[PDB]
């Protein structure tokens, strides 16, 4: 694409600069360019990819929720007719969000996942695949909603199966995967009991493994454990 | 809302 | 442009939605479209125009400052050579910022200012012209820096002359103009004494006129007066 | 920094 002429190392350097500058659209474009060089990504580079797109889609999702709320209020009884503008603009933001998700999913399918052999990398990418199908699910209303939901579930499940086999229960990627799959169950799959069970089991198995960790690894794992606890507190 | 990981 | 097919009222409606959604790029595009319909802007519409572009350029300016700081550090003694990337990316953000400024200045010149006969509108637009030349000045380094600075000064001065003739000293547009012209003097024109004098005189003349105001007008004016005080505190 | 008006 437009990054085709730039060195891989320069793209990664600029992604880091864009992060410092809070220029996440630019950061995502740089990381897309880096992925399209065709080499596997290192651990740090995978994190840059994830941070970039999470910030971009996070903005779009927040905007979509504002607009959907306004649209829902407009369609109540006693609400004055205000024409097609709210729906149009919600649709515009929605389409842009879907585009970002399709871009990320495209990078994963061509060809990050198939080249990812180590557990850390493969679980990371499958979690991403789950997450971006989940964002598509949040705005889906048509013939394909069920299939989108199943695509998320399938990716998360493959990631879970590998993580349980190949990573310790305190591994931050394993933890973040479980956290997000638990949210999928609660928010998307209408399975709050599954969400709660998953969060609880994940928290308890991690707790039991903390004794094996260095101070720095303990900090990484307990940060994510607190998010599991926060959700359990919200849900029970 | 429910917390998910990376955090934007 | 791409907004040519959309109703003026729909563009204004969508600008308001974009504001609620914190989608300032979209908000600016909608307001540009509205201006390009060729009708004068109402007071509320002028505010939407200003809020939209202020947020867009504000993001760019913040990013530019981060990058310029990093670039300045890279060019110190004992700093390792890191190649052209920092300068390139600073230049990219700079060019995008300049583009936004040129777009706003273009709207003002074609044809908001010439059609603006009432003091409130004419001062509002001339203040904007000053402000966007000031943002161009912040990043200017070449043959034209002096002329850019003078363009800002000239716009602010015309605005000041009209405001003093036609508006009370508590008028929020008059106050915000004076605040920004004082910052121009301090930050751009290397005239801190002029900045301080202007802020002090503006504050004192406003103070003396507060007795004429309603509770709501008093709130509007005193908010901006506090900004003048904040600058004076910083500067003295 | 120095305060300017609208505020982003
Ligand atoms: S990449 C080399 C240094 N850091 C790491 O390997 C991990 C340890 C720090 C904690 N990590 C995460 O919490 C994490 C989890 C998930 Cl699911 C996504 C992301 Cl982007 C991160 N950063 C990374
Ligand atoms: S537009 C009709 C209602 N409001 C107003 O007329 C003014 C009163 C409220 C205070 N205002 C400002 O402080 C102001 C000053 C400047 Cl220089 C720029 C902007 Cl965008 C505003 N909003 C508007
Ligand atoms: Mg749609
Ligand atoms: Mg189970
Ligand atoms: Mg330049
Ligand atoms: Mg004077």
Closest CA to A8 of A50, A29, A49, A36: A36
Residue listed under structure tokens 């000053």: C130
Q: In the Cβ-directed half-sphere of C181, how many Cα atoms lie within 13 Å?
A: 30
Residue A83 backbone class (left: φ over 0; alpha: ψ -120 to 50; beta: rest): left
CB contacts, 8 Å: A235 with chain B: 2
- Check if C21 contacts A (Cβ < 8 Å): yes
* Packed helices A43-74 and A24-35: angle between N→C axes, nearest 10 degrees: 130
Query: Residues near A183 by Cβ (< 8 Å), separated by ≥ 6?
Result: A134, A195, A231, B2, B3, B4
Whether C86 sits inside 8 A of A17 (CB atoms) is yes
Closest CA to A45 of A151, A116, A130: A116
Q: What is the resolution of this structure in A?
A: 1.6
Q: Output DSSP code: residue C186.
A: I
Interface test with D, best of C22, C24, C69, C176 (most D CBs within 10 A): C176
Interface test with A, best of C7, C10, C17 (most A CBs within 10 A): C17
**Which C-chain residues 126-165 have CB contacts (< 8 A) with chain D?**
131
Q: Output DSSP code: residue A210.
A: G
Contact A179, A199 (CB under 8 A): yes
**CA dist., res. A209 & res. A197, Å (int):** 19
Query: Residues near A125 by Cβ (< 8 Å), separated by ≥ 6?
Result: A46, A108, A112, A113, A116
Contact C195, C228 (CB under 8 A): no
Whether omega before A111 lies within 30 degrees of 0, making that bond cis, reads: yes
**Nearest CA of chain C to the CA of A38: how many Å?**
21
Query: Residues near A131 by Cβ (< 8 Å), separated by ≥ 6?
Result: A152, A180, B4
Q: Please classify residue A230 by burial: count the beta carbons closer than 10 Å to its beta carbon, then call 0-12 exposed, 13-18 middle and 19+ buried.
A: middle
**Lookup: tokens for A94:** 């929605």
DSSP string for residues in C34-101: HHTT-PPPPHHHHHHHHHHHHHHHHHHHHHHHHHHHHHHHHTSTTPPP--SHHHHHHHHHHHHHHHHH
Helix (H, G, I), strand (E, B) or coil at B4: coil
Using the CB atoms, write b or e for D1-8: b if 16+ within 10 Å: ebbbbbee
Query: Residues near A68 by Cβ (< 8 Å), separated by ≥ 6?
Result: A90
Helix (H, G, I), strand (E, B) or coil at A163: helix
State in Å: Cα C98 to ligand 5 middle: 9
Backbone phi and psi for residue A66, each to the nearest 5 degrees, phi listed first: -60, -50
Helix (H, G, I), strand (E, B) or coil at C106: helix
Q: For chain D, how long is the longest CA-to-CA vector? A: 15
* Packed helices C43-74 and C24-35: angle between N→C axes, nearest 10 degrees: 130
Closest CA to A136 of A98, A90, A190, A183: A98
**CA dist., res. A125 & res. C200, Å (int):** 59
CATH topology of domain A8-235: Delta-Endotoxin; domain 1 (1.20.190)
**CA dist., res. A201 & res. A228, Å (int):** 10
Residue C79, number of CB atoms within 10 A of its CB: 10
**CA dist., res. C117 & res. C121, Å (int):** 7
C-alpha distances out from residue A73 to A80, C14, C41, Å? 10, 16, 29
**CA dist., res. A54 & res. C183, Å (int):** 37
DSSP string for residues in A170-209: T-HHHHHHHHHHHHIIIIISS-HHHHHHHHHHHHHHHHTT
**Lookup: tokens for A217:** 């690894």
**CA dist., res. C134 & res. C217, Å (int):** 29
**CA dist., res. C24 & res. C29, Å (int):** 8
**Lookup: tokens for C4:** 């040519």
Q: Ligand 1 pocket test: which of A53, A216, A220 has the largest number of ligand atoms within 8 Å of its C-beta?
A: A220
Our answer on whether the CB atom of D8 is closer than 6 Å to any ligand 2 atom is no
Where is C211: in which H helix or E strand?
A: none
Our answer on whether the CB atom of C127 is closer than 6 Å to any ligand 2 atom is yes
Closest CA to A145 of A130, A155, A134, A157: A134
Count how many pairs of residues, chain A against chain C, have C-beta atoms within 8 Å. 60
Closest CA to D5 of A197, C228, A171, C113: C228
**CA dist., res. A137 & res. A189, Å (int):** 10
Backbone phi and psi for residue C48, each to the nearest 5 degrees, phi listed first: -60, -40
Chains C+A touching (3+ CB pairs under 8 Å):
yes
DSSP string for residues in A28-96: HHHHHHHHTT-PPPPHHHHHHHHHHHHHHHHHHHHHHHHHHHHHHHHTSTTPPP--SHHHHHHHHHHHH
Residue D2: closest C-alpha in chain C = C231
**Lookup: tokens for C161:** 């002359």
Task: Name the CA dihedral angle for A85, A87, A93, A96, rounded to a multiple of 10 degrees.
Answer: -110
**CA dist., res. A81 & res. A39, Å (int):** 53
Contact C162, C122 (CB under 8 A): yes
Method: X-ray
Residue C53: closest C-alpha in chain D = D8
For chain A, the domains span: 8-235
Q: Output DSSP code: residue C210.
A: G
User: Residues with beta carbon inside 6 Å of ligand 1?
Assistant: A 43-44, 47, 50-51, 127, 172-173, 176-177, 220; B 5-6
Whether A89 sits inside 8 A of C62 (CB atoms) is no
Q: Output DSSP code: residue C125.
A: H
Count how many residues are written for chain C.
Answer: 236
Closest CA to A135 of A58, A224, A48, A55: A58
Helix (H, G, I), strand (E, B) or coil at A99: helix
**CA dist., res. A216 & res. A223, Å (int):** 11
**Lookup: tokens for C37:** 């319909």
Closest CA to D6 of A51, A139, C222, C223: C223
The rounded Cα C50 to chain-centroid distance in angstroms is 8
**CA dist., res. C129 & res. C206, Å (int):** 24
- Check if C55 contacts D (Cβ < 8 Å): yes
**CA dist., res. C147 & res. C58, Å (int):** 23
**CA dist., res. C31 & res. A175, Å (int):** 45
Helices (H) and strands (E) in chain B, counts: 0, 0
**CA dist., res. A49 & res. A227, Å (int):** 22
Q: How open is the CA angle C143-C146-C148, to the nearest 5 degrees?
A: 95
Where is B1: in which H helix or E strand?
A: none
Ligand nearest to the CA of B5: 1
Residue listed under structure tokens 């399975």: A191
Whether C231 sits inside 8 A of D8 (CB atoms) is no
**Lookup: tokens for C17:** 């939605």
Q: Please classify residue C4 by burial: count the beta carbons closer than 10 Å to its beta carbon, then call 0-12 exposed, 13-18 middle and 19+ buried.
A: exposed
CB contacts, 8 Å: D2 with chain C: 183, 186-187, 231, 234-235
The rounded Cα C134 to chain-centroid distance in angstroms is 8
Whether omega before C114 lies within 30 degrees of 0, making that bond cis, reads: no
């Amino acid at each position: 694409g437009a990054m085709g002429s730039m060195e891989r190392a320069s793209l990664i350097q600029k992604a880091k600069l864009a992060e410092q500058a809070e220029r996440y659209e630019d950061m995502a474009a740089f990381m897309k360019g880096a992925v399209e060089k065709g080499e596997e990504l290192s651990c740090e580079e995978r994190n840059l990819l994830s941070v970039a797109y999470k910030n971009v889609v996070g903005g779009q999702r927040a905007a979509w929720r504002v607009l959907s709320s306004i649209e829902q209020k407009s369609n109540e009884e006693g609400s004055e007719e205000k024409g097609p503008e709210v729906r149009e603009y919600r649709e515009k933001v929605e389409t842009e969000l879907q585009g970002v998700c399709d871009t990320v999913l495209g990078l994963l399918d061509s060809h990050l996942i198939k080249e990812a052999g180590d557990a850390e990398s493969r679980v990371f990418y499958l979690k991403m695949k789950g997450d971006y199908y989940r964002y598509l699910a949040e705005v889906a209303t048509g013939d394909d909603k069920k299939r989108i939901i199943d695509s998320a579930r399938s990716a998360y499940q493959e990631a879970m199966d590998i993580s349980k086999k190949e990573m310790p229960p305190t591994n931050p990627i394993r933890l973040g995967l479980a956290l997000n799959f638990s949210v999928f169950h609660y928010e998307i799959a209408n399975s709050p009991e599954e969400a709660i069970s998953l969060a609880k089991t994940t928290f308890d198995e991690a707790m039991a493994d903390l004794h094996t960790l260095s101070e720095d690894s303990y900090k990484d794992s307990t940060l994510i454990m607190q998010l599991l606890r926060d959700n359990l507190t919200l849900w029970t | 809302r429910s917390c998910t990981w990376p955090l934007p």
